């Protein structure tokens, strides 16, 4: 029971987000629809935590489904791109059609059993993972907590990455 995915964001073995090779088809179509409607999307002003909408990714310049995580100053907010998993600060918000708000997030928050983490406590694991953003990893979902976060085992080319926390 191992599914292909890609680690898009890493904050540790306790907090990271991936993109299941399964949901890619849906995600692409989402992006397609968002790119064509973008220009004509209305301005978004209800700026408060948890507010769903469409924010502009400073790097891409493209708008994506986002959730306001923290309201800062000068109309700048830290937002979380639900279909990716990374956050950013921006000032560009446009409304998200209800039709396009129905789908589920396309990036899944995961973590490894904390009970099996660190034998040497590897912070170089961050490096090992980031060095391979362009690569395909594998996960076996042990469960999904009431929060939506999967508890998982991480694999790279058949090898369990936890092995990178010990000798």
């Amino acid at each position: 029971e191992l599914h292909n995915c890609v680690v898009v964001q890493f904050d540790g073995p306790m907090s990271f987000y991936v993109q299941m090779e399964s949901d890619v088809p849906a995600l692409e179509q989402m992006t397609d629809k968002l790119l064509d409607a973008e220009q004509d999307l209305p301005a978004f002003s209800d700026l408060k935590e948890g507010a769903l909408c469409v924010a502009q990714f400073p790097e891409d310049e493209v708008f994506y489904r986002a959730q306001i995580r923290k309201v800062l100053d000068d109309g700048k907010c830290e937002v979380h791109f639900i279909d990716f998993g990374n956050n950013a600060v921006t000032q560009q918000f446009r409304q998200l059609p209800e039709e396009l708000a129905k789908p589920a997030r396309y990036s899944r928050h995961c973590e490894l059993d904390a009970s099996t983490i660190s034998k040497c406590d590897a912070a170089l694991l961050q490096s090992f993972i980031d060095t391979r953003f362009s690569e395909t990893f594998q996960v076996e979902i042990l469960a999904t907590k009431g929060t939506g976060t999967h508890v998982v085992r991480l694999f790279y080319q058949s090898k369990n990455i936890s092995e990178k926390l010990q000798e």
Partner: peptide, 6 residues
């Protein structure tokens, strides 16, 4: 990349 933008 992945479902990003063009």
């Amino acid at each position: 990349a992945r479902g990003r933008g063009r």
